[PDB]
Design goal:
This is part of a larger assembly, with six copies of chain A (123 residues), six copies of chain B (110 residues) and two copies of chain C (117 residues). Chain A is mostly beta strands. Helices cover 4% and strands 33% of the residues of chain A. In chain A, the strands form three sheets. Chain A has a five-stranded antiparallel sheet. Chain A has a three-stranded antiparallel sheet with strand order 2-7-8, with no helix packed on it. In chain A, a hairpin with a 3-residue loop joins strand 4 and strand 5. Helices cover 55% and strands 4% of the residues of chain B. The N and C termini of chain B lie far apart (34 Å). By secondary structure, chain C is α+β, with helices and mostly antiparallel strands. Chain C is 24% helix and 34% strand. Classes of the chains: A mainly beta (123), B mainly alpha (110), C alpha+beta (117). The interface between D and E is medium-sized, with 27 and 20 residues. It is classed as virus.
Chain lengths: 123, 110, 117, 110, 110, 110, 110, 110, 123, 123, 123, 117, 123, 123
């Protein structure tokens, strides 16, 4: 029960180049992986967005969830250190998702859940 | 007029990738056009010059019409149905497209 | 904090990205500075009046997205404040990290004598 | 009067983009207008000048009328139905637009 | 008396923008008035002087009445229905307005 | 007695604003009163003086009565129904006001 | 005995304001009394002296009774119904008051 | 024995206030007692002395009885129903009190 | 499934003038953007209002949610640094909303959610 | 859909006299506004009452909610600095409500919600 | 809708003698008020009992709720400074309830809620 | 805190917006001042009585909506308290920000000798 | 409504010997009371077990609930200072329950609830 | 009611070798126990994954639950000090589960619940 055709969004998964710069911080250049399809589930309801983050620094972060077929998790290895780019229809501003982990289900081996952050763009 | 702009606006989905656009505009729209043209019991042509060419070549049958806007809307509804769900289920015959297409049917009889 | 004599001094490097006590709602990915007054030394005459200059110890914070950018911003701030008419930097910078936004910070105290009016 | 302002206020939508404004005003409105025209069994014209011009050339059929406000709002209701849902789910044959359109129908019978 | 004040109070929505007011008072209220006037099988005029003018010009038919308050209330109910929902659905005939309008019907027969 | 105080206490509303007080007391109350008057098949008058005056001029029909309290509360119930919902949703023909109004009905039959 | 104390205790609402008390005791209780007195097909008087006065004046009809406690309870039930809900809905005839009032009906026939 | 203690224990209520104690014991209890008396088609008396006194004056009808405990609890059940709900919602004709009261009924038939 | 006609409220979106004053604080002057339509969803229920805020300073803040068509998010770019003005019918006191972020849905590309604050007026 | 007749309670709204006393504290005298009608909704369920408040000072506070017609919010301007008095039937002890804010709905312009405190009497 | 006959428990309300002892602490003697009837509602479910209280002092407190007729709240004035005694059937150990406040409803004036503590006996 | 001799001194600038220990329920967007007593020096004679004057260290807070307004309010407070019969300001102001209401604050201590009765 | 036959588990209640040892700590010897029957209700669902306890000391505690007939609470007096032993079928490892309090219901006097801990064995 | 055939996953339980190394830390070698079958229940929904853990150290932990037959809990003795290995179909990356405790039910003696962690691999 995966019900194809609800996977109406074309995302773009991509990971980071290996190594470190002079200081040791992660390299702010991004490679490419490919394209897949998924069903995005929002957080409807009041108080679904987080404003403050840390030392009183303003923000606006709202977590989502992408349901993908089980093949995209075996072809690559998506984990917490990737980012996902999706573009809203007829728009030039593209959302940047930050993968916070992948939940896999054993009830049926045809689904997987990727939980993203979507709040602040990553570099 | 079943242009790429109209299809993109109807489906609310831009088709930038070449494979997806090829699928939608070469396997999915013509299927809806064939289905409507078969339900109407007549040949439908997009423009008058094509109708004249078909009449000249002799392939045009009885009662051919240039497609009005209602038939375009019904074809778009069938295309949206094809695009939404992609499995064979027990959906009923005489959907909401056949309500619009029905006054253009020609050889209704028994 | 005397705003203008700090904003005009730190504008050229940060392109006017200096704010009092709070970053704006959408501050961007470029480095920016936040200043705040956290005390000082009194300058009050016992006869019953206070002088036209008053000391004030301000705090400073730079919040870039890359470590090198914040390091350069802090060193430039320290140089420009140590080569200034009436300010003097005391102490050394302290680093900080914000995991939610993935930004790097810094923090240093400044002693300054400004014009009360 | 089925202008752009009335359509904008009915759908509660600003049609700033050229593409979707063209879609709504050139493929979605004529479909509803000609569907109502087919249901009414008569031709409907916007103004008296168009009716007189059509009668002069003989292309206007018998029993023509210039559109009242009830027919215009029935057309608006059909357009609002077209904008909302874009599939072929299957609906009752007689909707709430036909209740408004019915008293202007002609040539009813068996 | 179908004044702007009465319409604003009924719909519970002030109409300050010129386009919205034009829509409501020139496309939506007259549609309800036409529909009620067609269901009653008679002509309705707001004031007695207009009725006399129509009789003089000869355009007034049989059984014309000056609009009572019940017909105004039913017209307001139809207007509120038009303003609330803007799509064609399977709503039933003989709504709650036809209960109020019914005693004023004239040529009921079979 | 269908004064302003009784209407204020029935609706649990303070009609301070001139506009809405005018609406409720000049378009929403006469509608209910004349609807009940049409249902009862007779004319109803507030006081004996008005009944005598109407009989003197001959405009009062046969079987007139001055309003009892039951008819006044039926009118109040109709007004309360009018205030609450402002659309044409579709309702049963015989409501709870007709149960109160029925024993005063006249000229029933086939 | 339809006293202010009994009404206050039944409705569980003290009536200190003059307008509210006037409404309840001059528009709402008499309506229930009229309705019950009309359903019973007979005249009901609170006390024997009033019944004798009515008989003397000749206005008392056939079968007049001094009100028993069951009729008081039914009148109170109708009053509570009037006080609770204030809109005309599709409530059914033969409520729980007519069960108590029924043995006192006089001219039941066909 | 339908004293004050039994009524207090049945309703689980302390009738300290003079007003509500008077209400319950002088308008709500006699109503239930006379309702049961009307349903039974006979007169019921509390003690033998009252029955003998009523027979002596001739006001007691045929088939009188002094109340058993079942009739007293049926009266208590009716009173408990009266106390709980205070409206005219509409209920079945035969409640659970009639099942207790029925074997004492007299003069049944057609 | 947007169901027009439930968008019965006419709002007024407007953003802030760029630049800073002498001290660097945001300029307290407000420009204009235009008018749109949306469906406002309240927070019914007890404890839906927040009283204290910070150093024991009294307040009364109750967050709302506006559901808008997808066009108003592409025409402009509404983010956390805007404010929305709406007027209650037949009233002269106008609510001032403070946008705390926009949630966009990918299940259907015809809706968007703007979460506002509505508690304390902004300047 | 306001359903009059459920507004069975007669309240009494009243505001405070302006100005300050010698120390600057609010004046403990109360003016009058008028009477309105509303539907009171309690907080049923366990743990609906708050006992402690601050420096271990005992209390008993249970918040309510009054649903009023939209006219009483336009005639006056009810905000956090008012109090509402209502009397229980056949009783001499009167509840004192403390308004903590007004929630207005845009779904239909015929209701408003006043959230009160009802715990400790105000002065 | 009070539905008598569900009030199957006979409680015993009683208040404390006025005044103070030598130190000022409340007098640990208890007067009497009378008897009433009510419906007791427990807290079923796991974690419905509180173990620790303060400086690591063991306890076992489980709050209840008594639904009473509106007359017992007008005859006396039950508030946070009373206690209620109820006895379990065929038992010699009697529960001691501690009133933490009374919630009164305006939807219908025939009910009231008394929220008790029942955990540690009072003196 | 001795209320009157502080309220009458600070009323003209703030138009009577001085409150003890708590801001009112709806304080507005205009600047206002909150004062509170946080200690002092004893003035108790050992013989068994205390003097008719007593020291008390009060705290002050101004809460405007713009930074310039609170800066001017604080400098005016400092001047008016340093030019006063028996008060003296000790220390320097400390800033604060409240994101929920978007207001800017300040804070300074005052030493004052008031009349006990 | 107790529905006997759902009481399919045979427990074993037992209390502690009175007095104290040399240091005053509770005596770690256990007496016996008898056997009763009850219905055990688990805590199904994720996060139903508690791992840490205090100064970073590992643990695994999952609270249960035993529904017993009203007679076992009157015959003995079960309180927080007892323990209950139950044995899983066809097993030699026996669970040790720690009573944290007894909830009694007044809606019907034929049930009682004993809330246990079952996490760490008691001594 | 165990409904075999829903136990479609073949796990691998294994415990740790006894003793300690030179420092006393647990030995990082793992023995074997055997294979069993169970039904894995995920945590669907937003915010089901935990990111931070302790001193700002990144992580990604999502707890699961395995429903097993009652025999595997009596054959071995699974407790908090074990780990469970399961392999996703047609994949070479194997999940490592960390047992946090076993919940046993007495309503029917044919089920048991093993609550795992699945977030960070164990050694």
């Amino acid at each position: 029960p995966i019900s194809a055709g609800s996977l109406k969004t074309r995302l773009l998964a991509q990971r980071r180049t290996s190594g470190t710069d002079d200081w040791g911080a992660p390299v702010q250049g991004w490679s490419d992986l490919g394209l897949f399809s998924g069903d995005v589930k929002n957080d409807t309801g009041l108080g679904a967005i987080r404003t403050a983050a840390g030392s009183g620094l303003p923000a606006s972060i709202a977590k989502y969830s992408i349901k993908v077929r089980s093949e995209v998790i075996r072809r690559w290895s998506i984990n917490s250190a990737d980012r996902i780019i999706g573009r809203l229809p007829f728009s030039t501003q593209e959302m940047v998702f930050s993968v916070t982990g992948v939940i896999s289900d054993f009830a049926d081996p045809s689904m997987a859940y990727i939980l993203v952050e979507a709040g602040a763009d990553e570099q | 007029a079943l242009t790429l702009a109209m299809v993109q606006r109807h489906l609310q989905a831009d088709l930038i990738e070449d494979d997806e656009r090829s699928y939608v505009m070469e396997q999915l729209l013509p299927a809806a056009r064939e289905s409507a043209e078969m339900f109407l019991n007549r040949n439908i042509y997009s423009t008058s010059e094509e109708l004249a060419a078909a009449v000249a070549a002799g392939t045009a049958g009885q009662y051919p019409l240039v497609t009005p806007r209602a038939v375009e809307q019904a074809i778009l509804l069938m295309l949206g149905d094809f695009y939404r769900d992609r499995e064979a289920t027990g959906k009923p015959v005489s959907t909401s497209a056949h309500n619009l297409l029905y006054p253009y049917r020609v050889k209704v009889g028994v | 904090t005397y705003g203008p004599i700090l904003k005009q001094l730190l504008s050229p490097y940060f392109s006017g990205r200096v704010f009092p006590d709070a970053a704006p709602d959408v501050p961007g990915q470029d480095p920016y500075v936040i200043y705040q007054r956290v005390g000082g030394i009194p300058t009050y005459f016992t006869e019953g009046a206070l002088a036209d200059k008053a000391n004030a110890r301000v705090q400073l914070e730079v919040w870039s997205t890359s470590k090198q950018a914040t390091y350069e911003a802090m060193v430039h701030i320290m140089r420009s404040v140590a080569a200034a008419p009436a300010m003097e930097p005391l102490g050394q910078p302290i680093d900080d990290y914000e995991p939610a936004l993935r930004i790097y910070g810094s923090r240093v105290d400044i002693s300054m004598y400004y014009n009360l009016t």
